[PDB]
Structures are given as structure tokens and as C-alpha cells.
Subunit: 227 residues, 4 copies
């Protein structure tokens, strides 16, 4: 493939959350086929962020997923044309985090352009108070709809006091390559384990890691030969 | 006030809905105190729109509301500083329309800057198929939270076949003037009657009217003297 | 009509909320055509209730609504056959209150049979802590779907600390009379002002009043002659 | 334990969905420690069901889960006292299915008592039209809250035409044994693979199988030693 064992990627992020404008830049690399990656995000405008960086964790990279059981790779198949994704994450305490992202292959490096609009986060909530813990790993269900791919997941942000702030992700993935030229994957799961490796600079620079896997429900046996 | 019986307003809109980028410009005028207004919106990029213009109707103007029963006017009080609003509208069939808007008073004219991110609209739904009818009037509940104003409403888009595509609006209004310098209104209702007066150019130019009123539930009598 | 200027009604309620079983009985009367009513509810089992009685306020009477502007009365038309309604109320903090009710005319008295299932209310929330204030009046949108009537509303429970615990009601009203024999009302609003007149016995007996009105959006003028 | 390699269980179900009352009885057995089970459900009242039996699949058994990685078993620990669960499942097309269930150990057999209230299912939807396919396996996130256990999952019902009708389950599990006497499990996943083995009698008798596993996200490696 046009993807190397160690693919580098750059990102530019622009957004407004609860009326606060900000801008980020980031760089990282990962193993596309092993489904691992890491990057450093830098807030170049509006820093230090007045909210937990974590609500941006999923907006910083679907090319880095390890697909097992022969599941087709919608993202890797999309190159060199690339793809885009759109999503609205709804938090159980009222917040909404909407994002649109464009993924392209510029030479030997992947390029992400991200637009973000977040709102309604409670001023007294863990996010705006910036008192969150970490993301538990999340499992997304991905299936074909309208010729494109749809995904949904429930994620849980561990917060101090033994609390879990959950949210619901509603995603749509669009290949820039015609559906006719793609091998659409069937209904499957996509585990995403996100971990902030280091807070290089409070509210201004973070190092984030993610391991992802595309699989079927291997734990529970089927009696009718279903995936 | 710095608002005249006939206030003019200009708007610039930029957004992406279901992966489709677009840009609009608009101009209109209304009677701030009578709560009526009308404007012409023009799609200057990405036209003709591949979706019903109606999902943008609420993103094109809170300065034009007629407040009765002595309810404080959070928006008019905000000038000359101005204000902003953020919102995520969730549709019953899966679509999300997120918007952020900035309202300012530039001389004798109001200026709106709008950012929009919409996604997950079903390809076969009334919106993407562009087969909608009109908006029924909508009633929003507005109340103070976190020192700012929050609003929610359920709106219904009449569609062919006697169908009603409903959605839930989640809004936050932020004055650019300190809360200390504002007279916060109590819990009340805000009726918004939106009507597209003319489709000047299919998917490219529209004339929209809106009449709004800030009131209490006058129809049902209280026994404890509640608003 | 078979309804008198002063109609009496009896109710029996059975339910489980957050694992707590309870049973109620109630009696009251109201003016069907004036849209006013009042009743005394008595918890005969599982009392005193370990949660705010208010989450049961809407489950205790659609026959008592004052319809204006010539809007057809789906409920009064349903007699003597009667009708039923089903609803799930979702609270912004995670609670769900589901109810099914049967309305019948037994002689000169209306009879309500109610089944309730509530769950997921946060133990530390206003409802389970039983620290709520009162319901603001609520406006429901009612429209025809699938030959029956559907309704939705956003309600707000004022709570101490200047807080508003909101919820979303999802209702379906089914006449026991064939749709062919009914005059289906068009899209309209139904204001419901609920007020607990007296806490006769803490967590065991309450007196509740409600004034309701079926109307169109009279506050905001239409330019196309729409209701 | 008081649980045998082959545990039998009986169930009684009572409910109303979209105004349709029904009653069921069922019997089955499974391997508690292997997390497999199967039962035959019989509609004794209101049959044949006017809706897809599948919306009742999750209301027919948490004692049959195979926990790996040393995750504590909240359900098996609850005996002989037993436990209960409450849930509201929200469908993407508007339907709600609410249930309350009581689990007890009566001798050598498990006994389930289930109450169900479903409503708002579109008359033209896959459920009321009874044109559904099968459930994809579902992954639930389970975590401690308020001293009890909470769970959430997104499930997908495959339907003809390559469609996926998804829903969101909101659950609360309550042991009848004091929390102090229980070993609360940490945040984990619970895969549930439900399969209808046979439609013994259309809309009146079904054979359902389920394999379940309590686990951590083993597919994606952690860098900080997280489960």
C-alpha cells in the first residue's frame, strides 16, 4: 500500500467550545497495520484551554486501525483519494461536541483538517471545570448505510469521585473514492483505547496515544455461524 | 435605545452539512420592538444547496423579539457590546445541526457571523431529499443557568404525506456584557414563527420572515399567582 | 355531551420507580370545557414515597382541556368509548418515567387506570433526594400520526438553588373510537399548568391542580394565513 | 456456589406495547459459568404478538455470564438473596421499551418476574410491521454508580433492505444483598449475543439463545497498564 510501517501525520484544528475560540496544530506517527499511533497536540490560539482537553481526543485518525477476521479496511482503501468524517458527540450532562474532519495523503504524510463546534457544557460540569480523569476504552459499532459508513459508540470519561461521564458518538465516514470502487465492510466493532501520555504544558500541549482494532464479537459464540 | 424602529442586519454564514461545504450572505430588516423581521439569504458558495434550506432557518436573530408582561430583554440589553449564541439541533431521524453565531452592532446595522456543522442526516430523509413543507411555529423555554441564558424547544417541519419531522433545539445565549450589568429574565416562553416567503432561486436564494414573542403561559390560569 | 359542567374522576395507579413499588388511589373533579381540574392522590402502598411526587404529576387527564380557535377535541369525541395514552418522559439527568393509562366513562364518573415504570433516576438527583420545587407550565405540540395522535413537550421542574431539571415527554393518544368516526385536530399546542396545591401528608397524600388549553400560536402573526 | 453447571429458569412476563396487552411464560436452562443459555417463550395472552418479538429479547438473565480477567460477578454474588434490574431501551425511530425484572432463586430453579411498558413505536416501522431480521451482538459498558451497577449499550437489529435499526439501552442492576457484602466490579464490558433459534409458532412461541461474556478491552493494548 501507499502506507508505510510508520506513517507520519499532521493536523490543524479550529473550533469554538462554549464560546471559547481556539486553534491547534499537531504531529505524530503510528503503525497503520498494527493500529497504534501517538501525536503531540499544541494549542496555538486560545490557550490555555478553559476545558478538559479530553473532549477533543476523538477529533485530533481512522487510518490506524488493525482489522482482524478479514474485515475490509474502508479507510486504507480510500487512499490516495482520502476520506472525511463527521460527528456529533452528545454528553449525558448536556454538552455537545460536533466535528468535521478531512483526511488526505500529501506525499508521505497524512494531513488532517478539523473544524469543531462544542456547546452547552455545564459550567459546573467536569469538562468546563477541567476536572476529568481519563477515557475508558470505547467500542464503536460500524455499519454501511446510504452507501457510506455509519458508526456509533458510548464512551466513558472517568472523573474524580468515582464518577463516569458518558457520551454518545454519532459518526458518518465518507470515502472520497466511489462506493463502487470500494469493498464495504459488514457490521463490526471498532475498539478505540485513548490515553493521554503526558500533559506537556497544562491546557496547551498534550501527548495522546491510541490503539484501535476492527473486529467481530469473538468472545460470545454464535450457533448460526454469524460473525 | 440604540435600536431604531426599523433595524437592518447583515449576515455571513459558513458551514458544512453531510460533507457539503457552503457559504451564504444575507440582508434584512425588522422591527425590534414588534418582534418581526425579514431577510434575503444568498448562497454564494456550494449552491444550489443539496438539502432543504429549512435546517438553516434558525441560524440566519434574537434582537427582534416582542417581550410582554414586563419580561426583561436579555438581547437588547446586551448592546452595544452585543452577544453570541450556540446551539445543536437534534432531528428525530438522526441528523444534527450545530451552529455558533456572533451578533454585533456595527453603526446602525446589526452584524451576524455564523458557523455551521451539520451531519448524519439520512440520505433518504426529507432534508437531504429536499422534500420538506414548512416549519410550524415553535415555542422555546428560556431560563437562566450558569449566569447565562439557556433555551430549549421542540420544532416541527411539516413534510409531504402529512408527516412531521421534529427536532430538539439546545441553546445557550451569552451576553457580551457582564451578568452583573444585566437584568436577567425569569423562566418564560419564546414563540418563533418562521415562514419562507419566497424561493427566489431554487437552492440558492430565499426570503425568510419571522415573528417572535417573549411571554408567560397566559392561556392557563395559575392559582398561586405564578407567571 | 355526556360530560357535565362538573365531571368527577377516580384513578388507580400502580408502579415501580428505581425498584420501589407503590400503589395510589385518587379522586377529583373539574370543568371539562373550562379545562380546569383538581384531585387528591393517596399512596396506599409503598408510602411514604422515596422520591418527589412530581414525576407522577402527568400520570394522575386529557378530558379537561379548553380548546379554542375551533380545534377539534380528540378526547371528548372519544366517549363513551373512551381512550388511552402511553408515554415515556426522559429527564436530562438520566431518569425515565414510563406510563400507560386507560380512560373510561363509568356512568357519571371518569375512571383512570395507570401503570408506571420509572428507572435510572440518579440517587443524588433532585427527584430521588426529594428536593424539588414546582413544575413550570408546559407546552405540548400535538399532531396526527399513524391515524392516532402524537404529542411531545419539554417540561421544567424548578429546583432549589435556582435550578431547572428539564425533561422530554413522548406521548401517543389512542381513541377507542375508530379514526373514521373522529374529527382529527390539526397541529396545535396544549398548555398544561400543573400546581401541587397541598402536601396533605408528606410522601403519602397530595392535592394537585391543572389548567389546560388547546390553542394555536396566537402571539406571533402569520403572513400566509397559517394557524 | 448454589448454582449448578446446568441451571434451569422460569419466567413470567406481563406488558403493554403500543396499547397491546400481552402475557408470556417461559422456561429454559443454561451454564452460568460458561455464559450460555436458551429458553422457550410462550405468549399465553394477547397472541399472536402484533410486533416483532425481538424488542422483548433482552427482557426474557444476567446470571448466565462468563466473567474473565477476574472481574467480580455482581449477579452470582447476589444469591440466594437475588437481584433486580430496570431498563429503558430507546429506539432511533422513536420507540421506547421499558422493563423491570425481579430475579430470585427458588430452590434449584431461577425465577424471573417481568413487567413491560413499550410505546411510541412507529406503525410503519420494522417493529410494528413485524419485519425485522436479527440482533447483532451487543456490547454493554457496566460500571458502579450510587452503590449499584449501571449499564448502557447500543444494539442493532438487522432489518430487510440492509437496514440497521439501532437502540440505546439504559440499565440499572440492584443486588438484594447490601453493597457492603458485595465485591463491586470495576468498569468493564459485557458482550451479549442474542439469537432466536426457532419461531415455533408465529407470534406466539419462540426459542431464544444467548451467550454472554464479562471482559475488558483485550484487543487494544494499554500503555499505562489500564484494564
Amino acid at each position: 500500500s501507499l502506507l508505510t510501517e510508520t506513517m507520519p501525520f499532521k493536523t490543524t484544528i479550529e473550533g469554538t467550545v462554549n464560546g471559547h475560540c481556539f486553534k491547534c496544530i499537531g504531529k505524530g506517527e503510528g503503525n497503520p497495520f498494527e493500529g497504534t499511533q501517538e501525536m503531540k497536540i499544541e494549542v496555538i490560539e486560545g490557550g490555555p484551554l478553559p476545558f478538559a482537553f479530553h473532549i477533543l481526543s476523538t477529533s485530533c485518525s481512522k487510518t490506524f486501525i488493525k482489522y482482524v477476521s478479514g474485515i475490509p479496511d474502508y479507510f486504507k482503501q480510500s487512499f490516495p483519494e482520502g476520506f472525511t468524517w463527521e460527528r456529533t458527540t452528545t454528553y449525558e450532562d448536556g454538552g455537545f461536541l460536533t466535528a468535521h474532519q478531512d483526511t488526505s495523503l500529501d506525499g508521505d504524510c497524512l494531513v488532517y483538517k478539523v473544524k469543531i463546534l462544542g456547546n452547552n457544557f455545564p459550567a459546573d460540569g467536569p469538562v468546563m471545570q477541567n476536572k476529568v480523569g481519563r477515557w475508558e476504552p470505547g467500542t464503536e459499532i460500524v455499519y454501511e448505510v446510504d452507501g457510506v459508513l455509519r458508526g456509533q459508540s458510548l464512551m466513558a470519561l472517568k472523573c474524580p469521585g468515582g464518577r463516569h461521564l458518558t457520551c454518545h458518538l454519532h459518526t458518518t465516514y465518507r470515502s472520497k473514492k466511489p462506493a463502487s470502487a470500494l469493498k464495504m465492510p459488514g457490521f463490526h466493532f471498532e475498539d478505540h483505547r485513548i490515553e493521554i501520555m503526558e500533559e506537556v504544558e497544562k491546557g496547551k500541549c498534550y501527548k495522546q496515544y491510541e490503539a484501535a482494532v476492527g473486529r467481530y464479537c469473538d468472545a460470545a459464540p454464535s450457533k448460526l455461524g454469524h460473525n
